[PDB]
Symmetry: D2
């Protein structure tokens, strides 16, 4: 009673490797209806199904310069079943440009009673049947987001254990259905903590994640990790260089992520488009041994400038697509250490 056959393992490993192939990263376009509404609101655009469709089309149909930059695209359920103006389903559009289609499958955070505002994430019910259908409809990987926060009593032992366990359940169900799970334990940058505190918490969270994945018999070669970079908190007064951020990030990963993991696809969080590229580039130039692909799974850091240039106006299509292409090319170079605009750990 092994969880997976050699054939199933090969399929998962091959998918995971395609997504993070050299020079490639992930466009994270899986904002739910409530979250994308706030993005559209920031440009005074109504949150209609058509406006959401057109915006996703804008990103997915950028010119072929993005093909070598984008190994995967994460979609929200609605977008997976939408079509471009030429009638092609968006999964077909993505594949025709050399991309793997991903689907976000979690159903949001819920409060953990007895904690200081901590959450876990729901979405396991009927997940297997959903994954089998998503697989039939063109998806080959999935995403599940857990959220943790650095504070006085947080993240607590309960929150670390519970989020690690539910990530492992999600990963197990995905792999039974031919879907590569992206494991996203995000530690929010909120607060005034410093770099080494983020590093400490990240190390503890990731140790818990991989012990849980082991307990649940997860095939690591058929997974990806989507962590926060190790950074000071948003309100931290002490300032750090990108090389220090890179060193703390790579050290934390080296202390917790088994080499069998196929790749690490960083979330951009609250970083600017340039900051996310500079940090990712510094991570890839960090002189330590890094036995996994180190690339991007960016939302805002790929979309910010495209969203503004668009402004909800059809005539700004080309201008908006150019901004996205410029960030896709930048981060493709960053994940190779080719982008130009220690014992203390």
């Amino acid at each position: 009673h092994p969880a997976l056959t050699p054939e199933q393992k090969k399929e998962l490993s091959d998918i995971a490797h395609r997504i993070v192939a050299p020079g490639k990263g992930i466009l994270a376009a899986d904002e739910s209806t409530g979250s994308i509404a706030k993005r559209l609101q920031s440009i005074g655009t109504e949150n209609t199904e058509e406006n959401r469709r057109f915006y996703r089309q804008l990103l997915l149909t950028a010119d072929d310069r993005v093909n070598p930059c984008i190994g995967g695209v994460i979609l929200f359920h609605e977008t997976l079943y939408q079509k471009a103006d030429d009638g092609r389903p968006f999964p077909q559009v993505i594949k025709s440009k050399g991309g793997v289609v991903g689907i976000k499958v979690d159903k949001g955070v819920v409060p953990l009673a007895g904690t200081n505002g901590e959450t876990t994430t729901q979405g396991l019910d009927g997940l297997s049947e959903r994954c089998a259908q998503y697989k039939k409809d063109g998806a080959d990987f999935a995403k599940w987001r857990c959220v943790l926060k650095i504070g006085e009593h947080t993240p607590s032992a309960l929150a670390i254990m519970e989020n690690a366990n539910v990530l492992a359940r999600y990963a197990s169900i995905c792999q039974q259905n031919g879907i590569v799970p992206i494991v996203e334990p995000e530690i929010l940058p909120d607060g005034d903590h410093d770099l080494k505190r983020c590093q400490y918490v990240t190390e503890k969270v990731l140790a818990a994640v991989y012990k849980a994945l082991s307990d649940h018999h997860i095939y690591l070669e058929g997974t990806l990790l989507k962590p926060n970079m190790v950074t000071p908190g948003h309100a931290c007064t002490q300032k750090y260089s990108h090389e220090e951020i890179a060193m703390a990030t790579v050290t934390a990963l080296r202390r917790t992520v088994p080499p069998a993991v196929t790749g690490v696809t960083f979330l951009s969080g609250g970083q600017s488009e340039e900051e996310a590229s500079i940090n990712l580039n510094a991570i890839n130039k960090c002189p330590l041994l890094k036995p996994w692909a180190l690339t991007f799974s960016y939302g805002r850091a790929l979309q910010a400038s495209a969203l503004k240039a668009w402004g909800g106006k059809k005539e700004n299509l080309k201008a908006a697509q150019e901004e996205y292409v410029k960030r896709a090319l930048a981060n493709s170079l960053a994940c190779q250490g080719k982008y130009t605009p220690n014992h203390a750990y």
Copy 2:
């Protein structure tokens, strides 16, 4: 940042105590559509909504002799929103007879990959909103069933840990919504294992359950436990007395269940009606100290003869209700150690 206020704790504790008050147990009538279908096929009756309504009505409207016997009734979702012939919602029927209304909220078992046929249970998604709605609609306690199996390499560490964890998540969400959770970690009797193997596994499962409930800040006084009795496997060749089953059961509970737990409501599993009554009565006569109510949460051990006597025929209503009443009375006496058919310590 405590999970619950003193007012919320009092509500949950008062509910839990009402359900298992002396002489009272639970009617477990929460079979899902697929499971009740098998019950109806066994008496050649069609599985229609009306036949399900009629059958549930048959149990819930039995004469007032059941009132001091039934502290609680577990319903399936459909039944919570059905009505008796007089137009009364079934929850109002139950309450008017002194019972607390329960709702089963799990969404069935699912396979754990990498195990020898082991499962966990799903049903957490949107559970808080469901509990708030069920509370509004008259439910005060809930049920969630996890299933474990004694076998070669089972129950495994993973299966024990995961089922305990999901039970604790369910219990936490229930208590946030004023619903008393019934925690049901059922160890099936399938297999040829002997009595002391069942006792060992039951002790290990219950220790994991209560550590998980602690980790998730569960208020034990506002919970009930629905375990298997400790019995040999169905295929075991060695035979045991009811006194030995009782001693093994009470010993396992005394080694694992904190006295703050308000009550233990046993499942009947594959036991016959009489066997389940005799065993419960022996459990209550066991001379060891037992700091929780020890009563019943019975499905087939309350229903089997009523279902048969009914046979799907409206003219058999009174005869079917009489069979149910008889088992309700029997088990009311058994959960007091007062049941009669007339109506070594360190070896464990």
Copy 3:
């Protein structure tokens, strides 16, 4: 492959029940040489082997009024091999008065690196052989003390897990050698935390303790628990009644201690002689259901006045023994709820 046979289980259960039989508790006299030195220093007495022997003799040979009060006596290694003036080994003196002999077997606390001053406890190496010898030499139960502290980031997950685990190892070894283990996870009263914080930490620690005992296959009927009472911190500004202390303590125990545990023998900690008796009495009068004996395992709360009355002078023997008898009698009444000098909010 059960850990114990029915015969080994009966032996352990019988011992545990003798120690905590109704009206009985434990004299904890197992201060090591460095700790008893501070006690003798407090009365201007030199810390010699003979002064330690004499002081322990004073306690162990008090008159027969203590016999129904004292179910057990915990000794330090040295004392287990000392003799009274009549030539009798101290274990024989204890047994002759109806007491079970206990031996402290831990080797003190050690720091946990990476923690905010937290410790675990050492003493497992060669413990099985030590237990076998102690059993031959008249001991039937043992004691092992872990120490946890309430503070900003303490007790940490690491400290709770590690102390629970080492207690389980100790208990397992003891039970293989016919010794009933007393499991002592002391949460110190140091600090300004309030009563509900102590209750919260005590509930979490004891849940960890009993999960570890389960994982290690410990026979609970052949164990005793020696916990702190649930009290405010020593420096807490909010004040509480003995009844609140009792309610918080009994509630924490009811939420964590399986009924199979044979007895709970409270440590006195920093409490005065009278405070420790009043609190134990209030615990036994608490109206909730308590399915285990609730009695005492007291050091200073049985010894403080005896030590002062002695003052190191052999001519104060009887006066000092009288002070210990008075506290033994007080606490025997208290563990029955017979001593006189909403639960949903917990």
Copy 4:
């Protein structure tokens, strides 16, 4: 509350890297008195301190061809304080040849009650003081051996958790004293299980080991791992190539051992001299990515021919040393993948 300062970290990391520098491995000569007795008995030699000293001297004073092969030497306590014929302490002999001195610090296995013959390991009591003394006396790394067995119900959850936890306690204490800990969770080859069963158990054990090291705040860059290679059981009838053994071994390590671990020093266990060299060579030629040194920490695989050529006779000194030197050279090439005498299926 960080466990170590940057300076303490630098020292441990520097030591760890010196031991497993390219081409180098470890001579494991830390057999205790009882275990070396079995070795000497197999060559008809009396187990006296002098014969133990002479045999250890024979190994430690082998000619300078072993200097680039031997990065560290593990000694038993007795040997750390013995001297060569010329009066030089053995630690000075080792260092004068470019070797780091190691000390075995565990006190052997003890049974876990309630298990099917499983053990944990003892040795924590007073370990901090022992480590500080050993550091003073020339040791810079240590070894602690836990033993697990593949059987019907083994290794159990209890055995895995407890051995991982005690290994982490040992590692923590070592690092507080400037000693690099070698963590040895040996899964025995006993039994008739196949290669994938060993791989499965090895992955589960190592995942538990590294979670425990994380919980105890262990600095992984200042540690080494001494695991079993992944092999079929001794009584398994199915046959495997060295390339399959290598693939299963590297796959297991890639799934569990964080890249920050400085090196993996395989135990030889029951393997012959040639088999252990050939397997280590195939491990280093395995085409998968390996972010740690993969070298040897060998006892009998370095000593077997030398012990037999010696036969307890002083006049066989040079013939015996020659056999040891030949195996040090062989394994130095093997840990470089230069010794000569589908992946989804794992």
